[PDB]
Design a protein around this ligand. Structure first.
Ligand code: HEM
Ligand code: HEM
Ligand SMILES: Cc1cc(N)nc(COc2cccc(CNCCc3cccc(F)c3)c2)c1
Ligand SMILES: Cc1cc(N)nc(COc2cccc(CNCCc3cccc(F)c3)c2)c1
Ligand SMILES: C[C@H](O)[C@H](O)[C@H]1CNc2nc(N)[nH]c(=O)c2N1
Ligand SMILES: C[C@H](O)[C@H](O)[C@H]1CNc2nc(N)[nH]c(=O)c2N1
Ligand SMILES: [Cl-]
Ligand SMILES: [Cl-]
Lengths: 362, 362
């Protein structure tokens, strides 16, 4: 059953990939080679072209992503050659550097060796390569609550955070054959952060908020033609609402709205005053302003939705079915102000794609 | 097949209704009576108790409604006795008066005779009993675009609007056996309207916005135990966002955001300024303020969501399955600030319920 799943996935992917690349005459021979390789070895190896296009198709098929217009410009880094933890560490450091690009963010993915017998070669524990730690002991909350379990796992392994609200978690990953993951502190020179100030309200800086420049999702599995790349971190630039309406605003995250209301000088006493809504807007304006002032790429939800509309038009013009998850595509503030809110999307899963996988901690 | 559908629906409804009312011992005999009545007449007649509870269950089962906490206090008016267009007109006038209740809105439904052979006895053309007309000719847009087709149908029948942005449509409905509907102008003394002013910004009144007090949905079908009450208008009070984020804000409705931005003194030039979001918040604050000042019931989306959470808790505590449509339950502004956004809902259809039906115009 294993090889049959692999072979069927391979046939579907190679045919579609080669058609899109205008190389459909080469399909027959390539499938033969692959078929022999699966018979002999129990698997097959993607060409660099297949791997690059596969990762791009996977992005294009990500139902929950509003940023898909730019799928074809994804920068794909092939690191299937790595064998050592130093090599993995340095590849992750490099990804941060090249993706960051002095603030002019380049959407990038680094692809590590795939699973063999469902046996991972490299297992990345971080949710994002750059993220803040979280602590909760004896009623006291510090940092990012979403990071509490990973922070506790790291501290079990001999790491210790300074217990600020913005401790950078170390990189943490496990090599095949090793029992424990290793961890490495992020060099601060690699990590761009943005202090959050407001264009009009000077007191906003009193909140001492900041966020990191580049979201680099590092715990999802890239599946391409039946091959499981469980370790394949990828990044774009942020949409402002992710930081302002979710990370800094959620009650189970940094929960800053009452403090925002206070610095912008409005009461936070009555639901009918819509003080949470007003606070959300000002916090979200501050996030966009601050990133722009620092020269770090960011997109607002209105521009992003206009871009996604173009993606929809491009999909139809190319004869491709569009898939999407309405519940994730709508922004968390003013969704009815975007065209997304006013149409529906087929939530079918198409491969190649990025998938969730179980956390090795927890 | 007709009677079998009816009988099966009847059995399910009577059993559940009588259980909820603690009258389960009476089920057996009532089903017998009903079964004979279906055999003889091709249908059956609800008791007043069944009709009242049925309409309440239908509300409770309305997946898209955030206001369901109060399902059990629905005021049910039984007008299955009406036979004349004057009787229907006067019943509709009465519904407006008693639901409005001098501003202290009472959730109310008036139930007209049900369909016979799928033959409607009364067919209400209005979408809501109180709504504004819409016009579009030669590039010029006036009033509510959502009302354009019904407005044109009314004008075909000898009605003429003044062509303000807020012309009240007449009541328009058709009686069984009549070829054309009749229309009646709404007495202005019945219709409460609220001018929209802002608590802090005096210039907001320059927009000359207003809205009507009571949303009275009049084009849906109530289905109870296999009986189709195609004419059964119902009302609650508004949630502020329905007026501020949708009716006055949508580009295909009144489209007021640029004008709002101008009166609140912000530029409407750059997406990164989030001027639409800021305008939405101020417009929504103005709507809540204005209704409250006039003494007309209204609820904000935060309070409404807190109420819905109680509905969820009440459902589980009563052993009832909860159903809901996440895509309609989330408010159109600051949805992630409500608990609704952060959970999922089973969208199964349970009866009794309210359903869409085809428009007799268009
Ligand atoms: C270029 C800038 C990009 C922007 C502005 C963007 C925007 C977003 C946003 C707002 C989400 C919603 C996730 C959340 O609510 O937390 C999302 C989800 C997602 N994006 Fe993108 N994205 C970008 C680039 C990328 C790239 C380069 C990839 C992969 C190659 C990607 C794959 C995804 C995936 C897989 C998800 C959903 C993950 C999940 O199920 O949790 N995106 N994107
Ligand atoms: C008491 C105050 C009430 C509030 C605040 C309320 C709130 C809402 C809201 C915000 C919606 C969303 C509809 C839209 O986006 O246009 C809705 C939908 C709905 N409500 Fe309620 N509601 C109330 C009372 C009622 C009553 C009394 C009934 C019936 C007996 C009812 C039945 C429904 C139905 C059937 C829908 C969905 C209709 C459709 O599919 O378009 N509601 N409600
Ligand atoms: C590449 C990229 C760019 C950009 N601007 N934004 C993103 C956000 O994408 C992701 C990817 C993975 C996860 C998330 C955060 N959502 C939480 C997902 C989740 C699912 C199930 C259980 C959970 F606890 C959490 C967001 C990704
Ligand atoms: C009773 C009540 C109270 C309250 N505050 N709000 C409501 C709103 O409920 C409804 C009921 C019916 C229709 C709508 C408006 N949504 C449009 C529905 C729709 C569906 C399909 C096609 C359309 F053009 C329009 C809203 C109802
Ligand atoms: C296509 C999409 O489902 C549509 O715009 C829905 C979205 N959710 C909604 N939610 C509410 N409350 N009211 C609406 O009219 C809509 N419209
Ligand atoms: C339960 C619900 O689906 C959940 O809160 C979703 C809603 N939509 C979302 N949309 C985005 N973009 N990101 C999220 O994390 C979520 N969370
Ligand atoms: Cl994030
Ligand atoms: Cl309305």
């Amino acid at each position: 059953e294993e090889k049959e799943i692999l072979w069927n996935e391979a046939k579907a992917f190679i045919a579609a990939c080669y058609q899109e690349l205008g190389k459909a005459a080469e399909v027959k021979d390539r499938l033969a080679d692959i078929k022999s390789e699966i018979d002999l070895t129990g698997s097959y190896v993607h060409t660099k072209e297949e791997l690059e296009h596969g990762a791009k198709m996977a992005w294009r098929n990500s139902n929950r992503c509003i940023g898909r217009l730019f799928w074809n410009s994804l920068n794909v880094i092939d690191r299937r050659d790595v064998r050592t933890k130093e090599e993995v560490r340095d590849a992750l450091f490099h990804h941060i550097e090249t993706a960051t690009n002095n603030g002019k963010i380049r959407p990038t993915i680094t692809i590590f060796p795939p699973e063999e017998k469902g046996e991972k070669q490299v297992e990345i524990w971080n949710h994002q390569l750059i993220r803040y730690a979280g602590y909760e002991s004896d009623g006291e909350r510090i940092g990012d609550p979403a990071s509490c379990s990973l922070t506790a796992a790291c501290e079990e392994l001999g790491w210790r955070g300074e217990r600020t609200d913005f401790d950078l978690l170390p990189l943490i990953f496990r090599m095949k054959g090793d029992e424990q993951p290793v961890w490495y502190e992020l060099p601060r020179s690699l990590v761009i952060e943005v202090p959050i100030t407001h264009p009009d309200i000077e007191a906003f800086s009193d909140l001492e908020l900041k966020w990191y420049g580049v979201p680099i999702i590092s715990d999802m599995k890239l599946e391409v033609g039946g091959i499981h790349y469980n370790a394949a971190p990828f990044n774009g630039w942020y949409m402002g609402t992710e930081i302002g309406a979710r990370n800094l605003a959620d009650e189970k995250r940094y929960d800053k709205l009452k403090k925002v209301a206070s610095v912008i000088g409005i009461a936070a006493d009555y639901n009918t005053d819509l003080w949470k809504d007003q606070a959300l807007v000002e916090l979200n304006k501050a996030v966009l302003h601050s990133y722009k002032k620092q020269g770090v790429s960011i997109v607002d939800h209105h521009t992003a939705a206009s871009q996604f509309k173009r993606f929809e038009e491009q999909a139809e013009e190319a004869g491709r079915k569009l898939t999407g998850d309405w519940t994730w595509l709508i922004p968390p503030i003013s969704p009815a102000a975007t065209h997304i809110f006013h149409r529906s999307y087929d939530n079918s899963i198409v491969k190649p794609n990025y998938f969730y996988q179980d956390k090795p901690y927890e």
